[PDB]
Amino acid sequence: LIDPRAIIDPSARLAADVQVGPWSIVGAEVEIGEGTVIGPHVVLKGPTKIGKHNRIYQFSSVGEDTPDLKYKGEPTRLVIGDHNVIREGVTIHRGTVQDRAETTIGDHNLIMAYAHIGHDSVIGNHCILVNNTALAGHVHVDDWAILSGYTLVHQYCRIGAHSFSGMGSAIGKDVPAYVTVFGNPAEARSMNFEGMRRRGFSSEAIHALRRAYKVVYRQGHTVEEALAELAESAAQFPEVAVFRDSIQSATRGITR
Amino acid sequence: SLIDPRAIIDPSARLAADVQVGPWSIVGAEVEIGEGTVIGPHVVLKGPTKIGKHNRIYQFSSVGEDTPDLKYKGEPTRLVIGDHNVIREGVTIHRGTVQDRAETTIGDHNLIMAYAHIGHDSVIGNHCILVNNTALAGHVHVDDWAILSGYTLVHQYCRIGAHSFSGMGSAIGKDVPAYVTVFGNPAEARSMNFEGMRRRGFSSEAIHALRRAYKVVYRQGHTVEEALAELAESAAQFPEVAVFRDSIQSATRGITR
Amino acid sequence: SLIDPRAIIDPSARLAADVQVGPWSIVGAEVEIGEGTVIGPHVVLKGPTKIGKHNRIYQFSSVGEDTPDLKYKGEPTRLVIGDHNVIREGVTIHRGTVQDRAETTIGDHNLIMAYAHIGHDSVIGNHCILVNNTALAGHVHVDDWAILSGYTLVHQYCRIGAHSFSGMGSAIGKDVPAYVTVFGNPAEARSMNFEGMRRRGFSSEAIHALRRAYKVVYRQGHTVEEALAELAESAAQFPEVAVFRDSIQSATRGITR
Numbered sequence: 022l023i024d025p026r027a028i029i030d031p032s033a034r035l036a037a038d039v040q041v042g043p044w045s046i047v048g049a050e051v052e053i054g055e056g057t058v059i060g061p062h063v064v065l066k067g068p069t070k071i072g073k074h075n076r077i078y079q080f081s082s083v084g085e086d087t088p089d090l091k092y093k094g095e096p097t098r099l100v101i102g103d104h105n106v107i108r109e110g111v112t113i114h115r116g117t118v119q120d121r122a123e124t125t126i127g128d129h130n131l132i133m134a135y136a137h138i139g140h141d142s143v144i145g146n147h148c149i150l151v152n153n154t155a156l157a158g159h160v161h162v163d164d165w166a167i168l169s170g171y172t173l174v175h176q177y178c179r180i181g182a183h184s185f186s187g188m189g190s191a192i193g194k195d196v197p198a199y200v201t202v203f204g205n206p207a208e209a210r211s212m213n214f215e216g217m218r219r220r221g222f223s224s225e226a227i228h229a230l231r232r233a234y235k236v237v238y239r240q241g242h243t244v245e246e247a248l249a250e251l252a253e254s255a256a257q258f259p260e261v262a263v264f265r266d267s268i269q270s271a272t273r274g275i276t277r
Numbered sequence: 278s279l280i281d282p283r284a285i286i287d288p289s290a291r292l293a294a295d296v297q298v299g300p301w302s303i304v305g306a307e308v309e310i311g312e313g314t315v316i317g318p319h320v321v322l323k324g325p326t327k328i329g330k331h332n333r334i335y336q337f338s339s340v341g342e343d344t345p346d347l348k349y350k351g352e353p354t355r356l357v358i359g360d361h362n363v364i365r366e367g368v369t370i371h372r373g374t375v376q377d378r379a380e381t382t383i384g385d386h387n388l389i390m391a392y393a394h395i396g397h398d399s400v401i402g403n404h405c406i407l408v409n410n411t412a413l414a415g416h417v418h419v420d421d422w423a424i425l426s427g428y429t430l431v432h433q434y435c436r437i438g439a440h441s442f443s444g445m446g447s448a449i450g451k452d453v454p455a456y457v458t459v460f461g462n463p464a465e466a467r468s469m470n471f472e473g474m475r476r477r478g479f480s481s482e483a484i485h486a487l488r489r490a491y492k493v494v495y496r497q498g499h500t501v502e503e504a505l506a507e508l509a510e511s512a513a514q515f516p517e518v519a520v521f522r523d524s525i526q527s528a529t530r531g532i533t534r
Numbered sequence: 535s536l537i538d539p540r541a542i543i544d545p546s547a548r549l550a551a552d553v554q555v556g557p558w559s560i561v562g563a564e565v566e567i568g569e570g571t572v573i574g575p576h577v578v579l580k581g582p583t584k585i586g587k588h589n590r591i592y593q594f595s596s597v598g599e600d601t602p603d604l605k606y607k608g609e610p611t612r613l614v615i616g617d618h619n620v621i622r623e624g625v626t627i628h629r630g631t632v633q634d635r636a637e638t639t640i641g642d643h644n645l646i647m648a649y650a651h652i653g654h655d656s657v658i659g660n661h662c663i664l665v666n667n668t669a670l671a672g673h674v675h676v677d678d679w680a681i682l683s684g685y686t687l688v689h690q691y692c693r694i695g696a697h698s699f700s701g702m703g704s705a706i707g708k709d710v711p712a713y714v715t716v717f718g719n720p721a722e723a724r725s726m727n728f729e730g731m732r733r734r735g736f737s738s739e740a741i742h743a744l745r746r747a748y749k750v751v752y753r754q755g756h757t758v759e760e761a762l763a764e765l766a767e768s769a770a771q772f773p774e775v776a777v778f779r780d781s782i783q784s785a786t787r788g789i790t791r
């Protein structure tokens with residue numbers, strides 16, 4: 022299962038069932054969980070934890086140091102959950118002590134070829150990062166978010182649950198939950214109604230969220246005005262609280 | 278020896294005369310490689326895949342991987358590559374899907390530059406140039422002599438017409454007619470590839486007729502049906518204009534405007 | 535030992551005594567590596583290439599390949615890289631073409647991040663940062679301390695001035711004067727890199743003179759030649775203004791506006 026042309030550092034820790042292809046490097050302090058398949062020509066560096074039933078494709082560099090000059094070799098980590106697919110040539114950097122010293126990925130994420138997950142980024146669950154998507158650093162991607170091909174995300178930006186970025190988008194401000202954004206610079210267009218139907222949202226939840234978008238984007242309310250107007254919608258629908266919570270946590274302004 | 282002993286050749290792989298395979302390359306099951314093809318070092322070939330003659334594939338390329346667009350792959354789905362193609366460093370080419378074509382198809386004399394992506398069920402003709410990090414999302418048709426400049430992004434099902442040209446960083450969401458130049462995100466028509474026509478040995482007559490054809494379609498408020506009617510006479514005189522007319526006719530989902 | 539036994543070292547290669555080469559790396563014929571340099575695993579070095587001292591080259595980089603540019607027909611051309619450079623994952627650097635000076639040149643203390651592309655005949659100075667997926671198409675000159683943010687695209691023959699800055703996703707088709715800040719596709723001139731200038735310790739007087747010089751070129755309706763003639767005075771007083779003036783005077787592709 023561990024190909025004999027692979028290099029497994031002695032301090033690495035591999036569960037039963039783990040496969041490692043030829044000419045891959047499982048570096049010092051790299052933990053891998055049961056059912057995970059490392060392809061050929063993968064470089065893993067630690068300290069890193071990889072969970073269960075993950076698949077990591079050739080030419081990926083998972084757990085290197087950020088080249089960002091504000092990192093100076095301090096002990097920082099990367100954690101990856103379960104049932105993720107990391108495709109060809111993905112780069113994933115460990116955290117920096119200036120934040121939480123950890124880069125974090127949840128479960129059931131699909132990270133397509135040549136995607137870049139910068140230091141200190143947090144990815145939730147059931148996210149899709151399409152080819153060459155780049156998180157510059159300290160980027161938070163909530164559950165079910167889809168970033169289309171060559172989406173560039175600026176440092177510290179929050180990408181909301183069920184949000185969608187069009188291909189070649191450049192995101193400089195928080196994207197609220199459910200919002201669809203396009204272009205360079207990114208601008209809000211609508212709500213991810215497909216994402217909501219994928220979730221089996223009641224038709225009352227979807228109408229509540231359709232109206233919630235109007236209150237924030239199409240009624241000339243300021244962010245403060247919107248948040249108060251949404252309070253009752255948010256009380257009634259957990260799905261609208263996700264939206265309101267995402268705008269409330271947007272300390273530096275939302276994508277318009 | 279032409280086959281480096283550090284490469285992994287599957288027993289079902291078929292290598293023709295004068296094929297070279299560099300060290301640490303994988304030639305997987307049902308991969309066929311034609312006469313005089315050079316596989317670089319650190320290349321992953323996955324099948325079922327048919328590669329023709331006098332191709333060159335550079336290091337860190339993943340040729341014939343399954344699309345990650347489906348959670349559960351269909352099999353068998355094919356990749357077909359013709360002759361005299363250059364595939365540069367880190368290029369990804371995905372096989373077809375059982376739902377659509379079941380084949381990703383590349384013709385002859387194409388240049389696919391570093392880190393370009395050719396998505397499942399795409400079709401590339403002959404003499405095309407995909408510059409660095411060009412991405413064909415899926416079911417993209419690129420006709421003969423098209424040039425896509427660096428970091429050109431193409432949406433699913435879009436047709437890139439013969440002799441067309443995309444500018445650097447273009448995001449293409451609708452068909453590009455033959456000969457048309459497009460720029461920006463989202464892509465906008467600007468003119469025709471007059472430079473390319475001259476390098477192809479197009480008559481000044483053909484080039485003048487194609488200039489007029491551009492104005493008929495884009496500049497004169499015609500419906501497409503009206504544009505097709507207005508172009509019929511010029512298309513019958515010039516095969517070069519027929520290629521333009523046919524790219525407009527075949528564009529069911531609209532053209533880049 | 536410092537050379538991994540799984541690395542390929544061409545017998546013509548010249549390595550200083552403390553050079554490290556990781557496993558499954560290639561040091562090709564006529565590649566020279568200076569003292570203190572670390573080559574990671576899975577690196578492809580092709581020559582004729584000279585690499586200086588205390589460099590670091592990461593996995594999956596292709597350093598010294600021929601350009602795929604059709605104008606290159608296999609002529610003997612070179613790559614020269616200086617000292618204290620960092621080349622991150624998957625970087626591509628191509629040798630020169632005889633049509634220019636048969637050399638691609640990189641100075642010292644440069645940071646070239648993952649999947650950056652340095653095209654044939656490019657000249658990079660000292661203390662430059664090319665962020666992820668920056669692509670220099672060919673014959674691009676990047677002068678000292680320039681910062682090109684992520685996915686910056688540079689057209690052939692463009693010059694990037696000293697202490698200039700590009701925003702993420704910039705598409706530069708025209709020359710960027712020294713100190714100027716550009717953004718967008720196509721790239722737009724916004725301001726000067728005042729945070730760069732202050733971090734580097736430029737004087738308040740030089741920063742004020744550069745602030746006024748920006749107005750002269752961009753905001754007084756002067757033609758390039760009229761602005762150069764108006765810059766004459768301040769350029770004689772402040773070396774920094776002369777660097778600015780010179781970058782406008784040396785422009786081949788017009789200046790980013």
Ligand SMILES: O=C(Nc1cccc(-c2nnn[nH]2)c1)c1ccc2[nH]cc(Br)c2c1
Pocket residue numbers: 151152169170171186187188203346394396412413414415430432433
């Ligand atoms: O972009 C993709 N799908 C998609 C589906 C619906 C709307 C949009 C939309 N609208 N505006 N910009 N992108 C986009 C897509 C899917 C799979 C891919 N694989 C590689 C690439 Br590049 C890619 C791109």
Ligand SMILES: O=C(Nc1cccc(-c2nnn[nH]2)c1)c1ccc2[nH]cc(Br)c2c1
Pocket residue numbers: 149151167168169170185201210211212213214215216
């Ligand atoms: O739901 C998707 N796209 C979506 C959803 C809502 C509005 C729009 C919209 N609006 N204007 N243009 N595109 C688009 C979707 C689903 C599965 C996918 N797999 C890969 C990709 Br990219 C993707 C995208």
Ligand SMILES: O=C(Nc1cccc(-c2nnn[nH]2)c1)c1ccc2[nH]cc(Br)c2c1
Pocket residue numbers: 390408409426427428443444445460651653669670671672687688689690707
């Ligand atoms: O940009 C390229 N060619 C080209 C030629 C003529 C007009 C234009 C145009 N005009 N406006 N936007 N792009 C573009 C080009 C050629 C070779 C290359 N190799 C690597 C890269 Br990135 C690259 C880019």
Ligand SMILES: O=C(Nc1cccc(-c2nnn[nH]2)c1)c1ccc2[nH]cc(Br)c2c1
Pocket residue numbers: 137139155156157158173665666683684685700701702717
């Ligand atoms: O672009 C980056 N940083 C940056 C810093 C300051 C201003 C701007 C700016 N402002 N407006 N447009 N771009 C941008 C950056 C830094 C590190 C990275 N690592 C991977 C990627 Br992609 C990346 C991108």
